[PDB]
Symmetry: C3
Subunit: 228 residues, 3 copies
C-alpha cells in the first residue's frame, strides 16, 4: 500500500533484507575465527538495520510530507536516511577491514560518508527548491570523492594482500561504485527532484539498489575465502 | 507534577542519578591509574546523562503525545530513548572493559544494543497498532541476543581473569540480566503497550530500573577490587 | 537576509568556512605522512561541516520558532547544534592527537563535550523558562570541566613532547579556552537567553566565534611544524 502503492516494494525490501540477514546468520554458525566472525557481525547487522527501516516505512513510520516553496508536496520516506547513516559506514568498515586499511583511512571515509548522507537528508527535507538542489550537489560531490578515496586509498591498502583478498576487494569495490553512484541519480529523477518518476518508481529503484548494496554485497563478501 | 502525577518519579529519578553521580565523583577523587579512572569516567557519565534526561523529563521536555490508529492517546516520554541510546552502550563498555573483552566483541554488543533501543523508539512512536507490537517484538528479540552474547561472549573473555574480576563480572552481569529484561515487560504492561497500568506506574517502574541499572550497577563496579 | 537581516552573517560564515576548508585542502595536497594526513582530514571536515550547516541555516533549514511558556517566541537556529555535536569532538580529537593524549583521555573529553552540546540543545529548545536556564547552567558547568580537563589532562600528555608541539598545543589550547568560553555568554545575552541583543547581533557573534574556533584554529594547527 503506502501513498501510491509503493508499499509493495517496502514489503519486498523488508523480506529481501530479512532473508539475506537470515542466510548470513545460518552461514556463520560454524565460524569461531575472531576476524571472520567480525565480518559476519557487521554483514548481518546491515540488512537487520535495513529490514527494520523498510518495515517502519511499510507501516508508515518513516513517511512525512514536505510542502516546498514550489507548492509541490513531496512524500518523503525519511527513515531511509536513518538506515543509510549507519549501514553505509558499516559497509565501508566491512570493505575497509577486508582491504586491511588503517583506522585513519576507514574513519576518514566514514566521516566523508556521514557528510554525504546528512547533506542528502537536508536536500530531501528543505523546502527551498534551490537549497534542495544545492545540497544534492553538495552530497553528490562528497560521494564522488568518497568513491575516489575508496578506490585510491583502500585499493592501495589491499595492494599487498593475497590474490584472493584483492579479487574479493575488487568485486566489492565494483558493487559499491556502480550501485552507490546510482543513488543520487534516483533522487534526481524521483519525486524529490525532477519528478521524472513517481513515488512508486522511486521506491522500486531504491529497493533494487539497497538489496544489491547490502544482500548482494554481503553474499559476495561472506562467500569469499578472503575472510577466512 | 506532569501529566498524571508521574513528575514525582521524574524528580526523584533526577535526584538519585545526581546523588549517584556525585558519590561516584567523590569516591574517585584520588584515582590516578588510567584504567581505574576509565571506569570512573564511564560510570560517572552514565548517571550524568540519565540525570539530565530525567530533569528534562521533569520539566516536560521530551514528552510527546502519540495518537494511535485506534484513537488512544499515549503520553510518550521519548527522552528516555535519548538517554538509553548512550547509557546502554556505556554500560556495555563498562562491563566489557571489566571482562577484558575485545573491542570487536564490545562493538558487536554495542551494535545489537543500539538496534535494540532504536527499534524500541519506533515501537513507542509509531501510530499503527500492529507496528507497535511488531517493533516491540524485534527489540525484545534483539535484547535476547544481547543478553545471550553478554553472558556467552563476555563470560568467556572474563574466564581467564583473576577471581575477583570473575566474581565482580558475575555480579554485574546478573544485574544487567535481571533489570534489563524487565524493561520490555515495563513497556508492555505500561501505557505504551497493553496499558495494564498508567503513566504514573509505568514511570515508577522505569525509575526503579534505571536507578538499579545505573547507580546500583555503578556502585558494585566502582567498589570492587577488580577495578584496581 | 533572514528573520531580522541576520542572514548576512550566515552567508559570510558559509563563505568563510568554505574558503578555510579550501585553503586547508590546497595546503594538504602533497601530504603523505599518515599522521600528518590525519590532521588534515579532521581539520578539513570541521569547516566542511560548519559550511554545510551555515548554508542550511542561510536557506532557512534548521531555523525554527520556539514559543516559550511565557509567550515569548525565539527564532532558534537549531542546526548550530547539529554542527557543534560533531565539530567540537573533531576539534577535541585534533588537539588531543596533537597533544599525544591517550584514546581514554580523548574519549573522556569527547563524552563531556557531547553532554555539553546536548544539554545546550535542551536549554535552547525547552519551553519552560526555568528549564532553559537550568540546562544552560548544566551545560556551562560541563564546559568548565571540559576546559579544565583539556588544560590539565591534555597539557599533561603534551608535557613530554618537543618544544614546537607543546608550543603549538598551548596556542591551540588558548584559542579553545577564550573562544569556547564565549559561547555560553553569547547564548545568555542573545535571543535564547536574556535577549540583551537580538538575533542579528547573536548571529554575528556566533559567526565570529565559529570562524575563529574552526578556520583560525585550523590555520594555526595545519601551519605548525609539530604536525610534520
Ligand atoms: C545541518 C547539517 C550539517 C551537516 C552535518 C554533518 C554531520 C556528520 C559529519 C561527520 C560525522 C562523522 C565524523 C567522523 C569523524 C572521523 C574523524 C577521523 O578521521 O578520525 C581518525 C581517527 O579516529 C584515527 O585514529
Ligand atoms: C538536577 C540536575 C540534573 C542534571 C545535572 C546533574 C548531572 C550533570 C552534573 C554536572 C554536569 C557535568 C557532568 C559531567 C559528566 C562527565 C563525567 C565527568 O566529568 O567526570 C570527570 C571526573 O569527575 C572523573 O573522575
Ligand atoms: C558552500 C557550503 C558547502 C561547503 C562544502 C561543499 C563541498 C564540501 C567537500 C567535501 C565535504 C566532505 C568532508 C571533507 C572530507 C575530506 C577528507 C579528505 O581526505 O580530503 C582530501 C582533500 O583535501 C583532497 O586531497
Ligand atoms: C556516522 C555514525 C556511524 C555509526 C555506524 C558505525 C560505523 C563504524 C565504522 C567504523 C568506525 C571506525 C572504527 C572501526 C574499527 C574497525 C577495526 C579495524 O579497522 O582494525 C584495524 C586497525 O588497524 C585497528 O586499530
Ligand atoms: C545525550 C548525552 C550524550 C553524552 C555522550 C555519550 C557518548 C559518549 C562518547 C564517548 C565517551 C566514551 C567513554 C570515555 C572512555 C574513556 C574514558 C577515560 O578513560 O578517561 C580517562 C581520563 O584520564 C580522565 O577523563
Ligand atoms: C551507533 C549507535 C550509537 C552508539 C553510541 C555509543 C556511545 C559511546 C558508548 C560506547 C561506545 C564504545 C566504543 C565502541 C566499541 C569499542 C569498545 C572499546 O573501546 O574497547 C577498548 C578495549 O581496550 C579494547 O581492547
Ligand atoms: C528508521 C528507524 C528504524 C532504524 C532501526 C535501526 C537504526 C540503527 C540500529 C543500530 C545501529 C547499529 C550501529 C552499529 C555500530 C557498529 C557496530 C560494529 O561495528 O560491530 C562489529 C564490530 O566492528 C566487530 O565485531
Ligand atoms: C522477563 C523475561 C524477559 C525475557 C528475558 C529472558 C532472559 C534473556 C534471554 C536470554 C539471555 C540468557 C541466555 C542464557 C544462555 C547463556 C549461557 C550459555 O549458554 O553459555 C554460557 C557461557 O558458556 C558462559 O561463558
Ligand atoms: C550525542 C552525541 C554522542 C557523541 C557523538 C560524538 C561524535 C564525534 C564524531 C567524530 C569524532 C570522533 C572522535 C573519536 C576519538 C577516538 C579516540 C582516538 O581516536 O584515540 C587515538 C589514539 O590516542 C591514538 O592516537
Ligand atoms: C545501504 C544503503 C546505501 C548503500 C545507500 C547509499 C546511498 C547513497 C550513495 C546516497 C547518495 C545521495 C547523494 C550522493 C545525493 C543526495 C541524495 C542521496 C542521499 C540519495
Ligand atoms: C539505563 C537504562 C537501561 C539499562 C535501559 C535498558 C533498556 C532496555 C533493555 C529496553 C528494552 C526495550 C525492549 C527490549 C523492548 C522495546 C522496549 C524497550 C526499549 C523498553
Ligand atoms: C566549532 C564550534 C564550536 C567551537 C562550538 C562551541 C560551542 C560551545 C562551547 C557551546 C557552549 C554552550 C554552553 C556551555 C552553554 C549552553 C549553550 C552552549 C551550547 C552555546
Amino acid at each position: 500500500l503506502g501513498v501510491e502503492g509503493e508499499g509493495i516494494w517496502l514489503a519486498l525490501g523488508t523480506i529481501g533484507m530479512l532473508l539475506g540477514m537470515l542466510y548470513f546468520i545460518a552461514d556463520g554458525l560454524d565460524v569461531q575465527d575472531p576476524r571472520q566472525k567480525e565480518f559476519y557481525v557487521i554483514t548481518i547487522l546491515i540488512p537487520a538495520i535495513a529490514a527494520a527501516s523498510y518495515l517502519s516505512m511499510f507501516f508508515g513510520f518513516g513517511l512525512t510530507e514536505v510542502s516546498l516553496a514550489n507548492g509541490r508536496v513531496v512524500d518523503v520516506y525519511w527513515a531511509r536516511y536513518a538506515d543509510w547513516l549507519f549501514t553505509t559506514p558499516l559497509l565501508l568498515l566491512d570493505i575497509g577491514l577486508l582491504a586491511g586499511a588503517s583506522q585513519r583511512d576507514i574513519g576518514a571515509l566514514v566521516g566523508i560518508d556521514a557528510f554525504m548522507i546528512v547533506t542528502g537528508l537536508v536536500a530531501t527535507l528543505t523546502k527551498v527548491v534551490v537549497a534542495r538542489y544545492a545540497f544534492w550537489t553538495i552530497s553528490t560531490i562528497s560521494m564522488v570523492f568518497l568513491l575516489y578515496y575508496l578506490v585510491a586509498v583502500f585499493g592501495e591498502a589491499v595492494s599487498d594482500a593475497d590474490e584472493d583478498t584483492r579479487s574479493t576487494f575488487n568485486a566489492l569495490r565494483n558493487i559499491i561504485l556502480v550501485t552507490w553512484a546510482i543513488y543520487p541519480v534516483a533522487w534526481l529523477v524521483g519525486t524529490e527532484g525532477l519528478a521524472l518518476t513517481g513515488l512508486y518508481g522511486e521506491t522500486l529503484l531504491f529497493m533494487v539498489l539497497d538489496l544489491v548494496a547490502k544482500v548482494g554485497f554481503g553474499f559476495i563478501l561472506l562467500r569469499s575465502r578472503a575472510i577466512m
